[PDB]
C-alpha cells in the first residue's frame, strides 16, 4: 500500500499564528491527496480535495498545496475551533490510505508540574496488590520524564502513564504514572521515589516515601 507520513505528529499553535503541516506519500500520488479534520469526539470532516481545492462551507483560512509526494495543509491564522486532529488520504491508487495524523494543540507559556506521590492504600494491600501513583498536575509542555526508583533501583516495565486532554481553561496537561507490584514485591523494599524532569523545573523534582510510615 501507499504510505502517508504526516509531520509533525504534534504541532503547537498560538492563536493568530499562521501554521502548516506536512504529508509525504511513499510514492507518486499526483494531486490525489485529501485532508480531513477530526475534533475530539467527532467524525472526520473533509476539508480539502485534490491537494488544493477547498470544499464549500470550509473557512477560507484553510488552504492546501503540493503535488507528487509532498503536500501541505496551511491555516492562515488558526482559530480555537481549528484545535483538532488532521489527516491526509490518497486516492491515487487502491487501496486508499490515510496518514497517522497531526494533532494541533494550544501553545502557551511553560508551566512546571506540581508533583504528588501516593502510597498504596491499606485496603488494596489487603487485596494482595500495590499501586503507587505519581501525579504531575497542570504542566506545559506535554513532555515530561518520570522515573520510578525503589531502594535506589530504577524501575522498568512495571509502570503505566496516562495523560489528560489539554485543559480547556489553562491549556495544561496532567499526567499519572502508576507503579504496580505484588504485595510481596512491595514489602521487600522501603524507599519509593518518583523523579520528575520537566522543562519548567530548574532542577528535577523527587517525591518519595518510606513504606509503612505516618
Amino acid at each position: 500500500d501507499i504510505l502517508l507520513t504526516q509531520s509533525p505528529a504534534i504541532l503547537s499553535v498560538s492563536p493568530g499564528e499562521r501554521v502548516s503541516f506536512s504529508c509525504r506519500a511513499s510514492q507518486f500520488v499526483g494531486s490525489s491527496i485529501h485532508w480531513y479534520q477530526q475534533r475530539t469526539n467527532g467524525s472526520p470532516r473533509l476539508l480539502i480535495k485534490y491537494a488544493s481545492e477547498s470544499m464549500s462551507g470550509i473557512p477560507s483560512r484553510f488552504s492546501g498545496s503540493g503535488s507528487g509526494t509532498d503536500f501541505t495543509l496551511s491555516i492562515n491564522t488558526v482559530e480555537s475551533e481549528d484545535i483538532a486532529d488532521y489527516y491526509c488520504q490518497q486516492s491515487h491508487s487502491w487501496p486508499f490510505t490515510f496518514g497517522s495524523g497531526t494533532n494541533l494543540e494550544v501553545k502557551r507559556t511553560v508551566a512546571a508540574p506540581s508533583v504528588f506521590i501516593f502510597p498504596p492504600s491499606d485496603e488494596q494491600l489487603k487485596s494482595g496488590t500495590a499501586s503507587v501513583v505519581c501525579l504531575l498536575n497542570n504542566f506545559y509542555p506535554r513532555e515530561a520524564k518520570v522515573q520510578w526508583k525503589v531502594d535506589n533501583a530504577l524501575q522498568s516495565g512495571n509502570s503505566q502513564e496516562s495523560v489528560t486532554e489539554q485543559d480547556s481553561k489553562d491549556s495544561t496537561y496532567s499526567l499519572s504514572s502508576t507503579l504496580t507490584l505484588s504485595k510481596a514485591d512491595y514489602e521487600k523494599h522501603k524507599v519509593y521515589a518518583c523523579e520528575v524532569t520537566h522543562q519548567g523545573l530548574s532542577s528535577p523534582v523527587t517525591k518519595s516515601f518510606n513504606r509503612g510510615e505516618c
Partner: peptide, 14 residues
C-alpha cells in the same frame, strides 16, 4: 465509520 466515497476519490460523508 460508515462513509460515502465519491466515485473513487474522497470520503465525503461519514
Amino acid at each position: 465509520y460508515c462513509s460515502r466515497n465519491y466515485y473513487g476519490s474522497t470520503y465525503d460523508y461519514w
